[model samples]
Target: SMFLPPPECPVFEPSWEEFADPFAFIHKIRPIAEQTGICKVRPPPDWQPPFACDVDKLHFTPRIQRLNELEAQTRVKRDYTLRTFGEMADAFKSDYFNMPVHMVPTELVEKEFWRLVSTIEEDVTVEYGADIASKEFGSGFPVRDGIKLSPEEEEYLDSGWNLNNMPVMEQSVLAHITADICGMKLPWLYVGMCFSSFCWHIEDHWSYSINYLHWGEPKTWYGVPGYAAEQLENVMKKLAPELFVSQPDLLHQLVTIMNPNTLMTHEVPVYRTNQCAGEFVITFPRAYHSGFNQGFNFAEAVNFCTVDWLPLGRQCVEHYRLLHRYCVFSHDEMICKMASKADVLDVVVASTVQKDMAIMIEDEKALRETVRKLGVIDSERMDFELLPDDERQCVKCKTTCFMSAISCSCKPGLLVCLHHVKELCSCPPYKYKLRYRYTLDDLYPMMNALKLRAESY
Candidate 1:
């Protein structure tokens, strides 16, 4: 029997019905929960928010009425503002932020406008590293080196800010829907989206989320406790502030759990099939999920938020605070360790350090070039056979390659070199696969096992 099995979760081939309202399809995921027992219903955790308990009571409340009212009024104001202050606000805010604010004149509901304000409000605090401004907005608490901006300035900007918080609104709407479907407030926010690429990271305020795609396609890179933390710290240190600050808690949590981190992050590659539009991803608190594009036009999606077993209300804040405190302490420790290592290295090899630094710079430049060529080059075209089909000799050093060969400078089948060769390895940069993959079994179990429940329809 030829046991040729097809790839599981193949590009997410959703039907038109599913695509019409990705939320509808995602809302139906309750059946999976009902059958699985993992998605059991429960009260919100005491640690995180909505500042209320009594899940059934909140469920019975007409929250949609408020949302609808807010939406209706926002539409009129949004239209007026778009007509009156469209270009001016966009011009000012865009210049102020040093990034295009996407302020093209467009009418939106008041709800959306407020949400946009909320996002901007949060952005000032998070992205700008402005802790004081963030805290003024009630939830924009600082993490990492978040700057402390004055409340007066923040309020002045937020009071008249006309831009809509599209992502945050999208997040809030999903939170509402997910709660309605899953029966608990999951406490989450859409942290960010990688423009044009299929990458999005959702941060849980300690609850679970089921993210359903609508327009965009994205790929996810997931990490469990240990490795996720390490990779997150490395990513934070290296990636831009725009990328890391948005999801500060996730990064902090990753570092906290995976000290001396291991690089075990799994890239859950997501792509849209020709017939499919997007996807619906479910997430648990501290799930350590980061997505990437799967070689398609980056798509859009709505993330559904819900609680796992925790009870909701004022108590959730306490947990978040605790987490934040721990993160700060750990980060301090990490900084100290790094400083200590630098000091020791400087003291031990002060005379030789400058030369080493220069060499390292050259190596880094070469490595960057190597990476660039690898990304766009064809591997098979390389002339040198570092590892020929029938040969086990060193690819670069061959016979002269030492057991601890630093650089490939060996002749075929001989150990003639005892020094660390400095010449670059003459290998095709593109020979290695610049891609990643995951088995269905590895992903599905984790996704399915995450605690999520559908609320009363």
Candidate 2:
């Protein structure tokens, strides 16, 4: 129905030698490619993994998308076996869209997509497979499970960034400390059908995401660079102010299927890609991405943090605070956990973690002093770690509290960061008790210990 073209997403075909160090290659590309938000990786021709799932045997409930747009709306859902849903998707694409599975061009599909959504008054229904990964399917990549492996696959299985390999990643302080967060440890499996989609959003804690298209028809993607994250938000605010308006929380607010063409019209940089089977898509920290399935497909994705992501992780939490968004975990808790285990961290990772540690300590000291100047004293320090996750969270922003927080004697367990001291309670400032996780004196020693450990390494 439309022929307007959009810019293509960049592709990287790394030689086996270059792909040898996935993290190193990723770090090197951060400056040049991360700004574009998304990129595709084509492994050497021989680097193929077997897809062994029986389509008919796999079971899942299909999430029906009544509206073809991006915004969060109540979806009407029903159960569908994977094999049954695959036939439904194939029929709809070929019969309704009048496009064959392999011949569908993402750009043209995106154009026709809006055309259908604009005219149809009835719920334009499309079905998506369950978003959660099931353990029964196992990982699509080669894992160290005592099974035979190719020399090439073995190399990846040993790499720290490999989703199937975690022992190698334990060397990083972020992974070492937050070893129990299940989201960080497991890969999420996806089974996609035509028009099945993910809305525009960043990763939890603004961490990085890696998606592998295990098999099936191509999945199209649209990405906005990390540096332009704010730019994209500003554009969305201007066009869809309702999305940013006061709501219960960030997740529930409006998000719609706005075209990348619309974003590019506003001068926001965007990139697009058609990721086929066996290809890998990597999304950088805070990069906003959204897309739909070109046809029925199976993919697995995981979120991870590297030594380089530590600084951005801290910045992301601060941004979340400004937006009053809920956090997946306390950033300060993660940092201090690593500090406590500083002696065992890899030297290079120790060095990076210590640098972020210094920033956190200084930021806390400034916050405490600022609060003290505001006439808050009788401040008692509390072991935030002792409090349950729910109790330690800020009542106003819902951020996990550590470093410094203010609580009211009037409100027993409620707390808020110094930024929301006034929001803690209507009970006068004098009634408020400043609750701190660490003494400024204790923080300095902890940071110094990390520095010493890094040097010792």
Candidate 3:
């Protein structure tokens, strides 16, 4: 009949010093929201579910009076999917927005539509669950269940459905329309509320919510990184006052000494308006928000929220560049077009790198080996310079020479000082491909020898 207390915050609260960079938290929340489509963080491994309630008391209930009233008053009118019912109703002589209203032929009405709807009595139980009940109760009403549909339901619920005009007010149609217009990939179960509002809780998967209050007004509390510690303290004191014995005095002191901005951080003003018909709220992940009923006559509204994530085959630079280009366009247009363009960029960049690999990697292995030998010779020569009295090898060449006059030249075609050379090498000079394809190796070495020039430091 009841659930245990949910889990408490397990991780230590981040201090202000740890959050020195503001963007650190913002960047983290951004990806979580993109993936989950809600802002609530994941509970710890051993944590309890946030809220669970008995399902029986909070499920849907259908009222024929309301249904009949809506049917009689509602007329069908054609409008773009993006336009809300209010917008369409104002410009056209229509009963319902973007749906067929007057197409109920006598035979068809009897055989098809009315036959199915008439069987849908209000007392039926279609589903049973704590999650469903919690959603219904949190939303402020019971949901109507076990409503059967005609063959048209099959057509409407088809995988590739494209309903141009339909008089029925089915849930799926509303969801599809809302998602299409909002450019969001919404889940099937995200049924918009009639007069419902959730607590200041996060979404199922930490998603960014684009909440539209089609009928009533709602308020939201935004939580930035640094505000969490103090706000959590104040809220904890309010919700469970008995646990903190000295909280009253501390709270008063906290308010007195607190900056106005700090106090304001904990208190988000309630957003209230009458029939906030066209207003929409955009919230990113972990953005704490809640809603409340504004008036007795709460109308129906649709919400179109989606999970934000990187598409497959996109990563790092490719994803950032895609989003950057998207900002230049409107959100709607960008959503419609970003997928194709991102794929294009990925392909183009990969292909260009593949074509240029040969020129970039030439002589990589041999150059490294030559550099290694030069390092060994330099170390021996520099050691003698460091201690001239302990001349284990010739000071000039750093070689094992028995005779005082005996000397040796370093590796041919490798960088070496002339003062280290005794006998010239018989081996032909090492050559590399040149811009002119000319054999300038011997000539360049002779020019350097005559000038007695040294390598640039």
Candidate 4:
């Protein structure tokens, strides 16, 4: 049996007294584990969320994974109940893959994984439920569904970090606001059978993600810290250029499993964990992670943003522009939306948003002046929020236009930024329409309003 030791990831076991504030606790781990990218959080031994779903009744279409190829090429899928899938996963791990249950050491598994994938004309198949929200499974967590709960359970149910409890998240964080604007429900549930895997990827906008293994077998994870994100990308590009090649459809871009040993060999810091039932795994902003299930398991996860994440969100969008990746939502739009509702925001949130707003405003001012020097005029403001997403996006960067944008009469629906004015269209610069969402005068008031709100608090 092949066996290579796995690199250890940081683990936190905060006492009940220390775990009083979830956000504060999460923030505390930033400096220590942000570089490692992933942390295993074990709540007080008794802290278990109520698991109240019937395995027999729950049904979903399990996405098939072809071991040797990119995820996009695999199209075959089948429906399976939780109970049935468990058996399938168990057989795959214990019998098919010949993996030991207790601890097969992630490094050894990685060696075997590639060996199998590299075999000639051989294809291995696995199944998994990737990012399935709780609503799709009849509300796995306790919602405000008129069900009575014990005091302990009630306390857990009321936590702001709780996915089922997002409706009542009182914090004025960007995640909540984006969730509201996009109409996305909280707590994405992941159902994993044996060998089911998730490819290496970062959360959209480089937001933080919290995952809880509700029950069943452990989920093995390998993480690359936020700081090493670019390093890892470079390593991947060098090793598998095909994965990064421009594709006609973004979704068709190839993403497949890569050995952590390969990454560590290139001097990229890597960490691993086997998250068991009732354990929580937190991935910080821009942290890259990928993993496969040891056996059948059920986990719930959600993306969130904190005041600390605002600057990263802005930086993340800039990075996306360099890579030509699609934006899930505009970071600027979220910041501006929070500014518009400044008075209603939490004082801490208001202060942070105001700071980020100042940075955004300054950048826009510089951009406008630079474009003006290039013979571009600042035209009338457009209510970018009112326009459809497709129309309000920058043609060059795909950033959702909010503060200021440049448009052209030549291109009726398309818009561009000062940075990409030349890329806007074949139309001459004089024909360009410098469309803007807010004037500097209008923006100052919003930022000032946020400052006043923060001061009042």
Model 4 worst lDDT run, 10 consecutive residues: 68-77
lDDT of each: 0.26, 0.76, 0.26, 0.75
What lDDT tens digits, residue by residue, belong to model 3 across residues 1-457?
A: 1112111111122244432322233344554333322233222232211122343443333211121100111110111211232232222212222324334222232222122223435221111011111334332112223655444343334311111111012221122222122222321111122222232333222333343332322222233221143354466455445443322221121111011122244562212112232332334443344332211112222222221221211221123222221111112122222221323223322232222222222322343345344332222222111222223232333232211111124432222222233223433223211111112232233323322322221
lDDT of 1 by residue, 1-457 (tens): 1111111222233454543332343346534432221121111122111111221221110001121100111100012121122243344445544655543221121123223322423331111010111221222211223556554434322210101121223212222221121112222222122211111232333344443232222333332322143344455454334333323322232211111112222332222112112233444343343322221121222223322212221133234333331111111111112222333322222222223323333443454345444342321122112333223222333321111222222233321111212223444433332211122233233222221111111
Q: What is the C-alpha RMSD of each candidate to the true structure, in Å?
A: 24.2, 3.1, 28.0, 3.1
Over the stretch 1-457, how does candidate 2's per-residue lDDT look in tens digits?
A: 3424457878999888887777777887788678789999998797666556566767777676755443545312166766887888899888866767768766666766656655546466887764544544556666766467767667556554456663237544346544345565577777887777777878878888888898888888999999898889888887767667655644354556667777888888999888998899999988989888878888888877888888889988988788777776788888888888878777777788789988988888888888878778778988887776767777777788888789877888888898877787677677778887788788888888788888992
Rank candidates, TM-score, best first: 4, 2, 1, 3
Model 4 earns a TM-score of 0.90
* Model 2 misplaced stretches (Cα beyond 4 Å): 1-3, 74-77, 97-100, 103-108, 120-123, 135-138, 142-161, 166-174, 177-180, 249-254, 428-430
Predicted structure 2: lDDT: 0.76
Q: Write the number of the candidate with greater TM-score, choosing between 1 and 3.
A: 1
The lDDT, on a scale of 0 to 1, for candidate 4 is: 0.75
* Candidate 4 per-residue C-alpha lDDT over 36-75 given as tens digits, one digit per residue, 9 for 90 to 100: 8999998888666677777788887778777763333421
Which is the winner by lDDT between candidate 3 and candidate 4? Answer: 4
